[PDB]
Amino acid sequence: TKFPKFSQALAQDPATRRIWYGLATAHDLESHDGMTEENLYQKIFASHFGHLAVIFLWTSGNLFHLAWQGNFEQWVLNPLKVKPIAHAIWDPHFGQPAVKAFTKGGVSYPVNIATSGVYHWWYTIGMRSNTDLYAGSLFLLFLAGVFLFAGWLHLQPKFRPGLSWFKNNESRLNHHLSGLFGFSSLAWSAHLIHVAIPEARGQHVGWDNFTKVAPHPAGLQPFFSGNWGVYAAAPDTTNHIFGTSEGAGTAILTFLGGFHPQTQALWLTDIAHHHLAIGVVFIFAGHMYRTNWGIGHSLKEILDAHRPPGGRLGAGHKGIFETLTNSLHFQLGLALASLGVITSLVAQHMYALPSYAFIAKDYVTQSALYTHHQYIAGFLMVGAFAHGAIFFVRDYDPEQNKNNVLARILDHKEAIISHLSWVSLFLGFHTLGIYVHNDVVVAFGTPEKQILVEPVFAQWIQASSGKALYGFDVFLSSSNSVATNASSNIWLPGWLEAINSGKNSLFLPIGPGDFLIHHAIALALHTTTLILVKGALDARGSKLMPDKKDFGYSFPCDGPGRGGTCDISAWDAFYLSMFWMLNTIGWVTFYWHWKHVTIWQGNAGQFNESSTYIMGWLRDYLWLNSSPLINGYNPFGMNSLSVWSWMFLFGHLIWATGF
Amino acid sequence: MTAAYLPSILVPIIGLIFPGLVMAFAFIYIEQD
C-alpha cells in the first residue's frame, strides 16, 4: 500500500486507519518523510499559487453563472423590486410543484435567489450588462490559468527559489506594502474615478472608449497644476438617481461623509478619495525597509533596539527576528490573527457603513453577509491561536530566546491563565446571574424589579461621534466644541445627517439588553481566549505531563495513569475552543439578527423589552421567527423556503450525529 | 435560458459519472501495493 507516499509509517498500516490518516496529514508538509526546508518552502509557494487559482475560478464561476442564468440586466433597471438570481436549478429529483415554487425573479425556470450581494457590488463598481459580466468571468479564467502556470513554473528547475529569497523580509515587506497594498488601492481608485463613477452618472465607460472619455471635464490639468480642490467641486446632488445623469455631479474626489440619500450607501467619490489616500499612505509605508540601496530600515535592528531600559520586558525583542523568520507557524498565527480582526471589522463596518447601492434594503443579504464574515472571523482567530500552539511545540527554541518576550510569556503563563480564568468566571457568574434574575422576576409578574443597566459608556461614544439621542452634548454632539468646529467644513454635515437619521444602521440606539449581550460577548471572547491561550502555553508541558513537547502537538492522551490524561494535548484545547467559538459567533449573530429584525419591522421596542431576559430571546426571536421557515413545506403544500426548511432539519440532524 | 440543453447534459455527468470514476480510481490508487 503506497497511498500515503509521504509517510512510510502510515503506508505500512494494515487497517482502515491508513486512508484516514493519509487524508488528514496530506498538507502537513513539515511532518512528511525526508522533508527539507527548501522543498517545504517551494511546495508551499506552489500551493499558494494553486489556492489563488481556486479563488479566481470561484469568482469567475459566480460571474459566469450570473451572466448566463441571472437577471442582472433586469435588476439594474429596478434594483429595489427585482429579486437577484444566483444560479439556475436543474434537479431531477424535483416534482412539478417544486419547479413552480422556485420559478422566481421574472424568469421561466427554477432559480435560487442570491444572498451574497454580488449584484449590488457589481452594479456599484460599474457593471451594467451581462456582456461585461461574461468578459470579467473570462478574464478571471485566464488569470487563474496564469497563476496555475506560474505555480508549475516556479517549481521547475532553474526557477525554484532559494531559502534566502523566501526569508527576505525587507524586500517582501516593501513590495507587498507599496505594490500589493498601495498600488492596488491606487489602481482601484483609478477604476472608481475612470469607470465606476461615470457609470453611476449614466455615462458608459468601457475599454472601447476610456482613453477618450475624461473622468473630469478639466482633465488631469488640475492634478498637474496643484489645484486639486477642483476635483471636489460640484458633487452629486441629493436628487441624483443612481446610474443616470439626472442630478449627477462632476466631482471625482470628495470628503462629503454620510450616505447617498437614494442608494443609502457611501458616496463613490468619497470611496475614490479613500482608496487614493490609502494608496499614497501605503506606498510611503512600502519604502521603509532597506533592500538594495543603503536607505531604509533593518527589521533585525529595530527588533533588537526596542528593549525598554527599565528591564521590565527583560531582553526585550531580542531573538524575535530569527524566531519569527524561521517559524512559518509564528507567521501563520500572526497572519490569521490580523485577518480575523479585519474580517470582524469588515462585518461591523459594512453593515454600519454600506458601500454598495441599495444593499441596505436587502435585509436577507445584509444578514447573510454579516453572519458569513463573522463566522469566518471566529474560524480565523481559532486558527491563529492553534498555529501559535503549533509554533510552541515545533519551532520554539528556548536557548535562542533567552529572557525574551516569548520566554517571559512562558515564565508567567500561570499568572496569565489564572487571571483569564478569574475574568471568565467573574463575567459568567454575574452576567448569567443578571439574566436569570431578570427571568425569575419577569416570570413572577414584576418586570419593574429587573436589573437594567444603561450602557452609558457606548452611548457616550455615540454622542462623541455626534448622536444627539442621549443628550450627552460632548464632542461632535456639542455645537461649540473644537472637534465640531474642526470638521465642520469637510465632513460634519453629511456625517451628522447620517448618524442622526434613524433610517440606517449607523450607531444604532442601545439599551440594557445591548449592555447584557455585549457583556455576554465579553464572557465568550475571554473564555475562548482562556482555552486557546492555556492550550498554547501548556503545549510544551504541564505538571501532569512535563515532556509534552516530545509527544507533538496532537496525540490522544498519556493513558489512565497519573489520575487520567484525557484531552491533554494542545490540539485538544483547539478542539474544546471550537465549541466556544461556535457559541460566541452564535451569540453575536443572534444579537445582530434580532436587533436588525426588530428594527426593520418598526418594532425595536420588542427587542428593547424582551432582550433583558433569556425567555424573551427564546420566544420572541427563536420561536417567533421560526414560523415561515418550518412552514416551507407542510401537509398542505410547499413554497420556495422549503429548501431552507429541509436544510434546517438537515443541520439539526448532522449536529446531533456529531454528538 | 440560452443553451438550455447544457444543465440536462452536464448535471448528470458531473453528479454521477465524475464521482463514480473518481471513487473507482481513488479506490484503485489507495488499495494498490
Partner: peptide, 30 residues
C-alpha cells in the same frame, strides 16, 4: 444576452485551466 458560442469559449478556457491544474498537481506530487 450570452450566446452558445460565448459559453463554448468559456468552456475552452476552463479546459485549458484544467490542463494547467493537472500539470500543477503532478508537479506538486513530485
Amino acid at each position: 444576452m450570452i450566446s452558445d458560442t460565448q459559453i463554448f469559449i468559456a468552456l475552452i478556457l476552463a479546459l485549458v485551466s484544467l490542463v494547467l491544474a493537472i500539470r500543477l498537481g503532478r508537479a506538486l506530487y513530485q
